[PDB]
Design a protein around this ligand. Structure first.
Ligand SMILES: OC[C@H]1O[C@H](O[C@H]2[C@H](O)[C@@H](O)[C@H](OCCCC3CCCCC3)O[C@@H]2CO)[C@H](O)[C@@H](O)[C@@H]1O
Ligand SMILES: OC[C@H]1O[C@H](O[C@H]2[C@H](O)[C@@H](O)[C@H](OCCCC3CCCCC3)O[C@@H]2CO)[C@H](O)[C@@H](O)[C@@H]1O
Ligand code: NI
Ligand code: NI
Ligand code: NI
Ligand code: NI
Ligand code: NI
Ligand code: NI
Ligand code: NI
Ligand code: NI
Ligand code: NI
Ligand code: NI
Ligand code: NI
Ligand code: NI
Ligand code: NI
Ligand code: NI
Ligand code: NI
Ligand code: NI
Ligand code: NI
Ligand code: NI
Ligand code: NI
Ligand code: NI
Ligand code: NI
Ligand code: NI
Lengths: 129, 132, 129, 132
C-alpha cells in the first residue's frame, strides 16, 4: 500500500466529511479510497455504435431552436431521432439518439452543446463491443 | 329507421364514385354511411370536459420562416398540454414531429390547430384517445 | 345537382341533428354534404417513405410487451424508433416511427395492431412525394 | 486550505496512473481532486426533497428473461415518475431505451436502480437535472 497527499478546499471537505460520517467510513482516506474505486472502474468503458446526447437549452435566446435543428440536419445521417420535453416556459430538455462512427458522434456533440445557450450537455457513447 | 335524401352536385358525386370504386365500395349509402359514422365518431373524441391523451403528427421544413422556433414556442405557451415531442430529421429539409398531449380533449383540439394551421406545416394529423 | 337517398339509424341522426343545428346548417342534407366534402378531400393522400404507427396495449395480457418488441425486431430495419407513454397501470400508449417501402410499412402495422390486446391502432403514411 | 493523505494499494494506484496518463493528467492530486468533485457534485443532484427532471439510459436484450415485460412493468409500478420512454431497436437482440423522469430527484434514484439493477440490463446511466 502506497500513500498520496492531496490538498482539498474547506467546502469540499465539509461535504466529504458529512458524507464519510453518515455513509459509515472511519475517515477521509477510507471514503476517498472508495470513490476512486468506483470512478476508476467506470473507466472500463470502438469506432462505431450509438450514443445518447442530452442537454438543456432555451428556445428563444440566440434562436437556438432553429440553430440546433439546422445543425442536426447537417449531420442528419448520424441522427436517429430526437426526444424533447418542454420543462418550463424558456428551457427545453432534449435527447438525441445517434448512430455512426464515434468520431462523427464526438464531433456532432460539440456542434450542439459546446456553445452559448446550452447547459447540462452530456454524451454517453455505446460503441459496437 | 329513417331515410334521408342528400342533394349532391355532379362533381362531388363523380368523386365519391371513383374513390369508392378504388376502395371496393359498390354502393353509395354504404360509402356515405361509413364516412359519416367515421366523422361523427371522431367529432366525439374531441369534446371539451373529457380528459385523456392524444397523438399529434406533422411534417415541416425547418428553414422556411422560423417554423422551428415558432412551432417550439407555441408548444411552450401550452407546456401543460405537452408530454413530449418526438422529432425525426427526414432529410436536409423535412422534420417529422410527433407530440403526445394529455389533458382536456378540447384544449388539445385548439393546440393541434395553433400548429397544424401554421404556414409551412403539412401532413398534420390528430388522434384523441379519451381517458376511459 | 344529383340526389341520393340513404338510410340512417336513429342515434346517428340524433347526433347529426344536434350538430347540424349548432354548427348552423339548415338541414341534414346540408350538414352531410359538408362532411363529405372534407372527407373526400382527405382522399388526396408512393412506394417509399415514413409512417407513424399509434396504438394502445396492456403490457400484461398475452405478454404483449415482449411480443410487440420481438415483432418490431423482426422488422427492425423498417423501425426508426418507438415512443412510449405509460397512461395507467395496465395500458401503454406507443408510437412507432417507420421508414421504408409502404408495402413493408403496411405489413408491419398488421403485425402489431391486428391482434388481441391492442386498441386504437392507427397508421398514417407519409410517402416520398 | 487542508491537506489530506490517502492510503492506496499498489493496484488501485497503477490504475489511476495509466488512465490519468491516457487522459492527459500529469499530477495525482489533480486527477484525484477532479474525480472527487465530479463525484460529490453528482452525489448532490440526487438528494431527496429536490424536484426536477432526469434522463435514464440503458441497453437490454429483449429476449433474455421477459426483461421487456419486467422492465415495462417496473416503469408502470412507478408511472408517476415517468414522462416517456424512447426505445430504439439496435439490432436483432439489443434494445436502447431512454426514459425521461420528473419528480423528486430522490425517488428517481430508486427507479434507476430497480431497472439498472436488473439481470440483463447493461450500460445503465442516470443524469439528474434538479429543477432550479
Ligand atoms: O461530456 C462528458 C461529460 O463531462 C462532464 O463530466 C465528466 C467530468 O468533466 C470529468 O472530469 C470526469 O472525469 C473525472 C476525471 C478523472 C479522469 C478519468 C480517469 C483517469 C484520470 C482522469 O468524468 C465526468 C463524467 O464521468 C459533465 O459533467 C458531463 O455532464 C458530461 O457528459
Ligand atoms: O388504419 C386505418 C384507420 O382505420 C380506421 O379509420 C378509417 C375508417 O375505418 C374508414 O372507414 C374511413 O374511411 C371512410 C370510408 C370512406 C371510403 C374512403 C373514400 C371513398 C369511399 C370509401 O377512414 C378512417 C380513417 O380516415 C381507424 O378508426 C383509424 O384509427 C385507423 O388509423
Ligand atoms: Ni506499499
Ligand atoms: Ni446528407
Ligand atoms: Ni421545448
Ligand atoms: Ni407554466
Ligand atoms: Ni459540424
Ligand atoms: Ni456495449
Ligand atoms: Ni324508424
Ligand atoms: Ni429535423
Ligand atoms: Ni393557443
Ligand atoms: Ni386518423
Ligand atoms: Ni380507450
Ligand atoms: Ni343535376
Ligand atoms: Ni435484420
Ligand atoms: Ni407502458
Ligand atoms: Ni396510479
Ligand atoms: Ni412480419
Ligand atoms: Ni408528403
Ligand atoms: Ni486552510
Ligand atoms: Ni427494441
Ligand atoms: Ni420500486
Ligand atoms: Ni454522466
Ligand atoms: Ni439547471
Amino acid at each position: 500500500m502506497q500513500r498520496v497527499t492531496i490538498t482539498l478546499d474547506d467546502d469540499l471537505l465539509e461535504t466529504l466529511d458529512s458524507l464519510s460520517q453518515r455513509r459509515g467510513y472511519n475517515n477521509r482516506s477510507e471514503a476517498i479510497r472508495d470513490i476512486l474505486r468506483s470512478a476508476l472502474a467506470q473507466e472500463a468503458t470502438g469506432t462505431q455504435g450509438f450514443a445518447v446526447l442530452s442537454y438543456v437549452y432555451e428556445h428563444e435566446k440566440r434562436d437556438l431552436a432553429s440553430r440546433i435543428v439546422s445543425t442536426q440536419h447537417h449531420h442528419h445521417d448520424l441522427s436517429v431521432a430526437t426526444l424533447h420535453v418542454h420543462i418550463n416556459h424558456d428551457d427545453c430538455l432534449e435527447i438525441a439518439v445517434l448512430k455512426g462512427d464515434m468520431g462523427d458522434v464526438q464531433h456532432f456533440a460539440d456542434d450542439v452543446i459546446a456553445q452559448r445557450g446550452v447547459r447540462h450537455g452530456h454524451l454517453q457513447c455505446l460503441p459496437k463491443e
